[PDB]
């Protein structure tokens, strides 16, 4: 499958992960403003992180 991986508001980039049918967009606030980490798969997550898992290509924007 295909999914984004750029961090926060850097230009949209892609990462191809064959077979991985889900994707993720994690958001935590932190000291340095809203940080965002996108990637492949649907990961279990520590406390206080906005997780959003997704099912189509390049949908974790």
């Amino acid at each position, epitope marked *: 499958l295909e999914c984004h991986n750029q961090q926060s508001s850097q230009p949209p980039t892609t990462k191809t992960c064959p077979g991985e049918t889900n994707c993720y967009k994690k958001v935590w606030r932190d000291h340095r403003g809203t940080i965002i980490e996108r990637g492949c798969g*649907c*990961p279990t997550v520590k*406390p206080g992180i906005k997780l*959003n898992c*997704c*099912t189509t290509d390049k949908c974790n924007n």
Partner: nanobody, 123 residues
């Protein structure tokens, strides 16, 4: 094989409550204790699957999203193999399909996925 069965969907009047539950078939040995079992909410076109609650033995991987904090609560019967999500003071904004998922362990990816159950709050 592990397969996740949900139960408890339907229509709730605004302000009511309702308990979803997700039973992890497979691992019938009942040694799934640490499956990080997650509840996600899909509001159709708006947003994909939003993690609303995550249940693990590991504290850092057992919490609820701040949006629903105080209204939703998760419970676990590891022996009977069920992970329940009780929803109180249900608002219309909570109308969505709630899906269950299971990760093999804390920090691993949600590789198991559920059928989905609709919850409608409208009056």
């Amino acid at each position: 094989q592990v397969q996740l069965q949900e139960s408890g969907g339907g229509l709730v009047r605004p302000g009511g409550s309702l308990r979803l539950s997700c039973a992890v078939s497979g691992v019938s040995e009942s040694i799934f204790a640490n499956y990080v079992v997650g509840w996600f909410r899909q509001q159709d076109s708006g947003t994909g699957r939003d993690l609303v609650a995550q249940s693990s033995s590991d504290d850092e991987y057992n919490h609820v999203s701040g949006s629903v904090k105080g209204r939703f609560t998760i419970s676990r019967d590891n022996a009977k193999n069920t992970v329940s999500l009780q929803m109180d003071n249900l608002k219309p904004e909570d109308t969505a399909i709630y899906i269950c998922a299971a990760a093999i362990g804390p920090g691993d990816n949600y590789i198991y996925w559920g059928q989905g159950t609709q919850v409608t709050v409208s009056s």
